[PDB]
Design a protein around this ligand. Structure first.
Ligand SMILES: [Ca+2]
Ligand SMILES: [Ca+2]
Ligand SMILES: [Ca+2]
Ligand SMILES: [Ca+2]
Ligand SMILES: [Ca+2]
Ligand SMILES: [Ca+2]
Ligand SMILES: [Ca+2]
Ligand SMILES: [Ca+2]
Ligand SMILES: [Ca+2]
Ligand SMILES: [Ca+2]
Ligand SMILES: [Ca+2]
Ligand SMILES: [Ca+2]
Ligand SMILES: [Ca+2]
Ligand SMILES: [Ca+2]
Ligand SMILES: [Ca+2]
Ligand SMILES: [Ca+2]
Ligand SMILES: [Ca+2]
Ligand SMILES: [Ca+2]
Ligand SMILES: [Cl-]
Ligand SMILES: [Cl-]
Ligand SMILES: [Cl-]
Ligand SMILES: [Cl-]
Ligand code: NA
Ligand code: NA
Lengths: 414, 414
């Protein structure tokens, strides 16, 4: 008048809630004349009209009735007749730990960049529990891992929530994935728990610059190398992923004489020629090469292209004389013509042998390495032979050898 | 025998190179009988056959003749007749500073990320100079800038090259571009210089996490809110650029009861409803909201959606009686029926006025706020009126008010 009992949830049917008749001043001597009965649209309790006992009639699930409410009370009216009267009854439904905690998904992915500093904190999804009180108060535990630990905090209402903490730096180059296990154990009786797996995927950062396989790429190519030919191929390695690893090669500090001669592929890094090499013009090229990635990390190496000499220049003859005139009475040994040979090549390709083709009354006398004198060696008479067509030949010592001829007409005078 | 002169380049035509006749033992008394002349395919010098002077015949450009060679020598043969003889002459061509330095392009762009540490070094393109010696030895100067300075180094051959150095950190959020000026001055006489402009473009880094405009978005909506209605809109601001600024919003630590009720757009961040709100079930929702960017920076806020009560539940009447029986000789005031009203709403929407419709020999007597007793108030006789159809009405105090009726038949007994 009124009265309030208190029973745990999930009791079997027919469990004694109370002695409503005894507790409300009734006597068994008038248990039937009064005809007590319960009145409620929910068939949760029934009054035994023989002895007056309030009993459980159906399943009383506190989670379905009150949910997350801190208190669970069921209010109804027991009505009696002769005389008619209402008797308000309230029954408190205590919570039992009959529900385990749960996570939203069994496996959760978490993207964390390798630039995360030691001590960085990342939010973790908390567990849910339809119970109340200590039966839903959770305790979180992370399985031991060399890189990640767990800190546990509490909200302003006392409920716990976990956070992942980084205690050792990450390196996608070393380990791109970490598999963690999280467990939630409630504080009810008995203890109930659940587990979820966290796949930490290490997001790539551009912490690795390109690295050339060599700080110097040296090669020797002949000067008669056709245009478009491959000469060498540089190579840079980037340990990072995606755009952080795409490398673009380019020449640096290059001149127009080399810009019109060589080409470096931006992607493949293969060096080729686009013009004609000439040993007589330049015998070596030192070129700086730069490699860049997506994050603008740079690396620098050098390329030395040495050019070897080829015998692609024929010897040259230059002649002089006294207006191509010779007096017929000239003494033996008189200078008649001057010979000057020259070859643009080097080594034995540039060495010159100069000789006289024919059977003339003349003779070549060598003065220096590249200077000769055509001198008279025989008789002369304008009446018999008025002029001589003297042919001088020059041949280098290359492989294959090259040669050239030059013929001068020498007139005989009286 | 031989002889080697030395003249600067770019001399006017007719400039005296030397006195070849005097220097080679010749005398003017036989200047004509000898007929000295120069022999070379390049028309660079001519011998005056009157006095024997070697003179400049055409333009002698050392850059076109020898290029970048440290020394420039022109070797030719002066030939004399009567008697015929060769005379080797070498002429050293000195270099003058008649060429300015040059850069490949007037404006150069350079991408540098704002993560560049103080002291970082970046390669700069060196200037080119077709001169040699000190006339091509360059000196680089950077115009004063608060963020960038310049260091000057030298290769193993003594040639200088510049490098840009960062002395103050970069912040694309503060200044995305820096305009620098580079000048190269050679060491010749007179000094020649050239300028190039360097547009440093600051590459964006994800150094700015998202920032919510509010740490709490509170709003009050009625329970009869139709599904699909907009309730609020969160907002996060990211100062960075591109993917580093694209923000994705999502709920965190959400349950299935709320997952089936609310929806948060990943792009617009607009919160809407997808189910039906019921004040009788839950009057408030506190939801955690997460905002992420491309670099996985995170921000967290909260959203509180309060639900206000609406009068959408009609009052309910529950009746009891002694098998719907009344004895005709019952005394005035006898309990005949029990009335139990209840309303699920709150406030005045839940307050109940219970009244009797009709002119019966009965009367409602209130016992508690929600319990009444139908009591006899008049005469009774089964021979005259054997039964009464008593209609009880209940009306709440909401706006608009709701009501309900329930009619019970009470039989009159002898
Ligand atoms: Ca339960
Ligand atoms: Ca429970
Ligand atoms: Ca539990
Ligand atoms: Ca790394
Ligand atoms: Ca990396
Ligand atoms: Ca990289
Ligand atoms: Ca050649
Ligand atoms: Ca050659
Ligand atoms: Ca040759
Ligand atoms: Ca010049
Ligand atoms: Ca010059
Ligand atoms: Ca110069
Ligand atoms: Ca910044
Ligand atoms: Ca930024
Ligand atoms: Ca950002
Ligand atoms: Ca409602
Ligand atoms: Ca309502
Ligand atoms: Ca109502
Ligand atoms: Cl009583
Ligand atoms: Cl070059
Ligand atoms: Cl002589
Ligand atoms: Cl929730
Ligand atoms: Na003769
Ligand atoms: Na009567």
């Amino acid at each position: 008048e009124p009265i309030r009992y208190a029973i745990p949830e999930e009791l079997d049917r027919g469990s004694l809630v109370g002695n409503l008749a005894k507790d409300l001043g009734f006597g068994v001597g008038d248990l039937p004349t009064r005809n007590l009965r319960v009145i409620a649209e929910k068939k949760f309790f029934t009054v035994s009209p023989e002895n007056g006992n309030l009993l459980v009639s159906d399943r009383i699930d506190r989670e379905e009735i009150c949910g997350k409410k801190s208190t669970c009370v069921l209010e109804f009216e027991m009505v009696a007749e002769k005389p008619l009267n209402f008797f308000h009854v309230t029954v408190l439904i205590q919570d039992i730990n009959d529900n385990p905690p749960t996570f939203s998904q069994n496996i959760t992915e978490l993207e964390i960049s390798e630039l995360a500093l030691t001590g960085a904190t990342f939010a973790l999804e908390s567990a849910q529990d339809p119970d109340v009180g200590v039966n839903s108060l959770q305790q979180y535990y992370l399985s031991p891992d060399p890189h990640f630990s767990l800190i546990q905090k509490e909200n302003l209402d006392g409920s716990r929530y976990p956070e992942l903490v980084l205690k050792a730096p990450l390196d996608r180059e070393e380990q791109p994935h970490h598999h963690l296990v999280l467990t939630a154990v409630d504080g009810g009786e008995p203890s109930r728990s659940c587990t979820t797996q966290i796949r930490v995927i290490v997001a790539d950062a551009n912490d690795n610059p390109p690295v050339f396989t060599q700080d110097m790429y040296r090669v020797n190519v002949a000067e008669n190398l056709p245009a478009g030919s491959s000469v060498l191929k540089v190579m840079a390695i980037d340990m990072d992923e995606g755009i952080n690893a795409e490398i673009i090669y380019a020449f640096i500090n290059i001149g127009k004489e080399v810009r019109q001669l060589f080409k470096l592929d931006s992607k493949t890094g293969e060096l080729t020629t686009i013009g004609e090499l000439d040993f007589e013009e330049r015998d070596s090229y030192t070129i700086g090469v730069e490699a860049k990635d997506g994050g603008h990390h740079t690396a620098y190496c050098k390329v030395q292209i040495d050019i070897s000499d080829e015998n692609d220049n024929a010897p040259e003859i230059t002649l002089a004389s006294e207006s191509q005139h010779i007096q017929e009475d000239a003494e033996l040994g008189t200078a008649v013509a001057l010979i000057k040979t020259h070859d643009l090549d080097s080594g034995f390709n540039g060495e010159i042998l100069c000789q006289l083709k024919g059977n003339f009354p003349f003779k070549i006398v060598q003065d220096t390495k590249n200077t000769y004198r055509l001198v008279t060696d025989g008789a002369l008479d304008r009446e018999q032979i008025p002029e001589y067509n003297v042919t001088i030949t020059a041949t280098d010592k290359g492989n294959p050898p090259l040669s050239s001829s030059k013929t001068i007409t020498l007139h005989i005078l009286d």
